[PDB]
C-alpha cells in the first residue's frame with residue numbers, strides 16, 4: 001500500500017491506487033468539469049490543471065477545462081501515464097505542494113455527497129459484444145436446444161452488434177418500461193403493448209483512447225495502446241420485443257430504450273495489478289486475433305435487486321470479469337480489422353457476463369431460466385423478470401494487498417410504462 | 419427565378435435550395451451554404467438577413483461548422499429560412515441583388531469548394547424497407563418459400579449502423595480485410611473481401627428529436643424530418659455472411675458508407691409526393707397514417723472501371739418502391755422511448771423495384787454472381803473490382819425545373 005493525505009477507509013472504492021476520472025457538477029457551480037475520486041472526495045482537475053508541468057501535458061492543459069473526457073482520452077498513453085504520476089505524487093501524504101496549500105485545497109476538493117455525476121464522454125459509437133461462453137451457451141440452449149446452442153461462428157470471432165449511443169445514460173437515471181410490438185401467440189397477429197419480459201444484463205465496457213485512421217486496422221500488438229479505462233454497464237433488455245424483431249438483422253428496440261453505465265472511468269493502469277493469463281481458446285484463433293500478452297482481469301461483480309416494498313437489497317448474482325472468452329484486445333482488433341475507424345470516447349461492451357455456477361449468471365433470463373425458476377429475493381418475495389419500482393444496482397471490486405479498486409455503482413430504477 | 423443564372427438542367431434551381439457544409443482555399447473553416455445554380459450562398463455571411471420571429475434570436479446557428487443546431491430548431495425555423503432565401507434570391511428583390519459588396523462576399527463557385535459531412539451524426543440506423551429488395555435477398559439465402567421472414571410485413575425491420583465510417587461523396591473506400599468461410603466444411607480464412615458490393619439507398623436527417631423515454635406519435639413524425647441525401651451502403655457480402663447470425667450486420671457494413679453532401683429539405687420534395695403503397699396486412703394503429711409520404715425520385719447508378727472511357731448506367735430505380743414510409747420508420751424507431759437527436763441519420767434500406775433493371779445492389783443485379791452484368795466495352799461485372807467507381811444521382815422532374823441531389827460517388831481502392 002501507499003497513502004494519501006486524504007483519509008481513505010480500507011474498504012473504499014477510491015484509494016490512491018485507483019484514481020478514476022469522471023465528470024461532475026455541484027449545487028454551487030453547474031458547469032460539468034473533470035474530477036478524480038479519492039476517498040469520499042472529488043479532486044477538481046480544472047482547478048489544479050496548472051500543476052501538470054510535465055512534457056506531455058504542459059502544452060495540453062486545456063483538456064482539463066473540457067466538459068467531457070474525449071480530448072484527454074484522445075491524447076494517448078504518454079499523457080495518461082503522466083497525469084496519473086502527477087496525481088499520485090500530488091495526493092501523496094508525503095507531498096506538501098497540494099497538502100499544505102490550504103487555499104488551493106479549499107477550491108480543489110468537493111465531497112462526493114455534494115456532486116452530480118454526468119456521462120464521462122460524448123460516445124460517438126457504442127458496440128456490444130457477446131463474449132461470455134456460458135452466457136451464449138445458456139441463451140442458445142433456451143432458444144435453440146443444447147444441440148444447437150452455439151452457432152458455428154462463435155468460437156472463431158468475437159461476435160457483436162452496433163448498439164444505440166443516444167440512450168446510454170449515467171447511473172441513477174430512471175428507466176421506463178418500454179412499449180412495443182410483441183408476438184406472444186405464434187398463431188395470432190402481433191400486439192402493441194407494454195413489455196412483459198424486462199431484464200438487466202451485467203456487463204463491463206471500455207472507452208477507446210486515440211483510435212485509428214479510416215481504412216487502417218489496429219494490429220493486435222498495438223491494441224493495448226488504445227484502451228483508456230473501464231466502467232460497469234447494465235444493458236437493459238426487453239426480451240419479448242427483441243424476440244419478435246431480431247431476425248435476421250439483430251437486436252434493435254429490445255435494447256435501445258436504455259443502457260446504463262457507472263460514472264467513474266477506472267484507468268487500465270489501475271487494473272493492471274489484477275491481470276491474469278488469458279483463457280485457453282480452442283479452436284485456436286486466426287493469426288490476427290492471436291496474442292500472448294495477458295489481458296484478462298480479476299474483477300468481482302455483484303448485482304443486487306431492491307423492490308419498492310423491500311427494506312434491504314438482495315444479492316442475486318455474483319460473477320467475475322475473468323470469465324470472458326474473448327479479451328478486450330481481440331474485441332478492439334476485430335472491430336477495426338475491416339478498417340472501421342474507432343474514435344476517442346467510443347464504448348465497447350463485453351457482453352453479458354456469466355460464469356459456470358448458476359449464481360454467476362448475468363441476466364434474470366438465465367437466473368430464472370426463461371421464467372421457469374423463481375429467483376428468491378428474500379422476505380417471501382420472488383422474481384422471474386423485473387417489476388415496476390425494482391432497482392438494480394451493480395458494483396465491482398478488485399481486491400489487492402490491503403486495498404480495493406472499486407467502480408462506484410451502476411444503478412437504475414424501473415418506471416411504469418406509459 | 420433567381421438573379422443568379424441557373425442552367426435549365428441544373429440540380430439546383432430556386433425550387434430546391436439544399437443545405438451543405440463547405441470550405442474554400444481562401445477560408446478553410448467549414449461553414450453552412452445553400453446551393454443555387456453552380457454557386458454556393460454562404461449563410462454565415464448573410465446571417466443578419468434572417469430577421470423573422472423564429473430566427474432573429476438564433477442567427478448564430480448559421481455560424482456553426484455543422485447543421486445540427488439548425489436541424490434542432492424545428493419546422494418553424496426551417497420554413498422561415500426557406501421563405502427568406504427564396505425572397506432574397508428572387509430576381510425581383512433588391513436587398514442582396516443590389517448590395518454589390520455583400521454579394522461578392524456571399525457567393526462562391528461550387529467548382530472551387532470542398533464539401534464536408536453536413537452534420538455530426540450521433541447515431542445511424544439502416545432499415546430494410548424495400549419489399550422487392552428483401553424478397554430478392556430472401557430468395558437467394560432462404561429460398562422462395564421463406565424469402566420474407568414473418569415479422570417483415572408487421573414492422574419496419576432495421577439495425578443500428580456504424581456512425582464513424584459515414585463519409586462524404588468522393589471519399590475513396592478501401593477493400594476490407596476480414597474473416598470469410600468459402601468452404602462450409604473447412605475453418606474460416608482471413609483475407610481480402612471478394613464479394614464487395616454497393617447498396618442504393620436514401621436517408622433522412624432528424625430535426626428536434628424526442629426526450630429520453632417519450633415516443634414520437636405518428637401524427638407528429640412529419641415534424642421531425644429535416645431533409646434527405648443519397649447513400650451508398652458499401653457491403654462486404656462474404657464477410658457479412660459468416661458473421662451476421664444471430665446478431666446482425668457488423669464488419670460487413672462498417673468499413674464505409676457514403677452520403678451525398680447536399681441536404682434537400684422536405685419542403686422541396688412535397689410537390690413530388692405520391693400515394694403510399696397499400697399495406698396488407700394493415701399495420702397496428704401506432705404505425706397508421708393517411709398523409710401521403712412516398713416520393714417520386716428517379717435514382718440512377720453508374721459504374722466506371724479502369725480501362726473504361728465512359729461510365730455505364732447499371733441501375734435505374736425510384737424511391738417510390740418503398741413499402742414502409744419515413745413516418746413509420748421514425749415512429750417505430752421511437753416507440754420504445756429511444757431518443758432520436760438532431761443530425762441522426764435514418765436510411766431507407768436498399769431500393770429495388772420489380773423490374774430487373776431497378777435492383778439496387780450488384781448482388782441482385784448479378785443474382786449472387788450467376789449473371790454477368792455487361793458494363794460495355796467488352797467488360798462485365800458480378801461484384802466490384804479494385805479501381806471501380808460507383809456514382810449515384812437522383813432527380814425529381816417538375817414542370818420546368820428539376821430538384822437534384824448532386825452526386826454520391828466513391829472509388830474502390832485495393833486492400834492493404
Ligand SMILES: O=C(O)/C=C/C(=O)O
Pocket residue numbers: 248555556559658
Ligand atoms: O435478410 C437477410 O438474411 C439478409 C439481408 C442482407 O444481408 O441484406
Ligand SMILES: O=C(O)/C=C/C(=O)O
Pocket residue numbers: 139140143242664
Ligand atoms: O443468440 C441469440 O440468438 C440471441 C441472443 C440474445 O438475445 O442475447
Ligand SMILES: [Ca+2]
Pocket residue numbers: 128201203235351352
Ligand atoms: Ca448486452
Ligand SMILES: [Ca+2]
Pocket residue numbers: 544617619651767768
Ligand atoms: Ca443497407
Ligand code: NI
Pocket residue numbers: 001002
Ligand atoms: Ni507500499
Ligand code: NI
Pocket residue numbers: 011012013395397406408
Ligand atoms: Ni464498494
Ligand code: NI
Pocket residue numbers: 152605
Ligand atoms: Ni468450427
Ligand code: NI
Pocket residue numbers: 225
Ligand atoms: Ni506498449
Ligand code: NI
Pocket residue numbers: 427428429811813822824
Ligand atoms: Ni443532375
